[PDB]
């Protein structure tokens, strides 16, 4: 129906904590083919991240049990893990479909482009977490490509403390460590990102500082974990 009605319903869904509905409303809004505002981008991202987040958490619980049994001591665990996986792949595919059909090519500015390319890398990363065989290889390649393009734009267009730039770098470092099994690249990126941002914090207002250091603390937390 009308785009404005879909946005209204997405915001109602959000207040109601109805994230599947929220995502479906935002999908309909994207499909109108107009750009999304900052607010609207965030509605889309929050909705789908809540949906995939539930599936990822469930998949991890089930995969852990499944792995713990395929050592020593029915098909139920496997079967249910497979069901949740298929669901997760469907949601990731839907998001990537929106990004490739509409959002990336229609974005009118640098910030939007980085936002959507990062999302592209993230949803490939979530696919990579559950993938095997040839699927996993092609997914990993796709994630790296998306993240790297986003990184190139962000380095040209955004200051080092910019929260979008910081969050992209954080997630790409997670990719390197968890997905690509490149711990050295992970640490290198996280440390460089942190150091180049620390350099500029003394120039920031209270609110800017809070937004930047939220992400910077996560880079730090990962560095502790990874060393």
């Amino acid at each position: 129906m009308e785009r404005a009605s879909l946005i209204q319903k997405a915001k109602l869904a959000e207040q109601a904590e109805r994230y599947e509905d929220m995502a479906a409303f935002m999908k309909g809004a994207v499909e109108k083919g107009e750009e999304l505002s900052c607010e609207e981008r965030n509605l889309l991202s929050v909705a789908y991240k809540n949906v995939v987040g539930g599936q990822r958490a469930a998949w991890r619980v089930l995969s852990s049990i499944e792995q713990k049994s395929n050592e020593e001591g029915g098909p139920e665990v496997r079967e249910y893990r497979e069901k949740v996986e298929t669901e997760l792949q469907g949601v990731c595919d839907t998001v990537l479909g929106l990004l490739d059909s509409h959002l990336i090519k229609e974005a009118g500015d640098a910030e939007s482009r980085v936002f959507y390319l990062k999302m592209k890398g993230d949803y490939y990363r979530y696919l990579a977490e559950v993938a095997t065989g040839d699927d996993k290889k092609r997914i990993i390649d796709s994630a790296r490509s998306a993240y790297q393009e986003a990184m190139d734009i962000s380095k040209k267009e955004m200051p080092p403390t910019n929260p979008i730039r910081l969050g992209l770098a954080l997630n790409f470092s997670v990719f390197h460590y968890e997905i690509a099994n490149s711990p050295e690249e992970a640490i290198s990126l996280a440390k460089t990102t942190f150091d180049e941002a620390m350099a500029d914090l003394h120039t920031l207002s209270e609110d800017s500082y809070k937004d930047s250091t939220l992400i910077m603390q996560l880079l730090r937390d990962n560095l502790t974990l990874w060393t």
Binding site: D122, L166, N222
Partner: peptide, 9 residues
């Protein structure tokens, strides 16, 4: 433990 990624508001 799993690595932390960027949060959503």
């Amino acid at each position: 433990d799993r690595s932390s990624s960027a949060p959503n508001v």
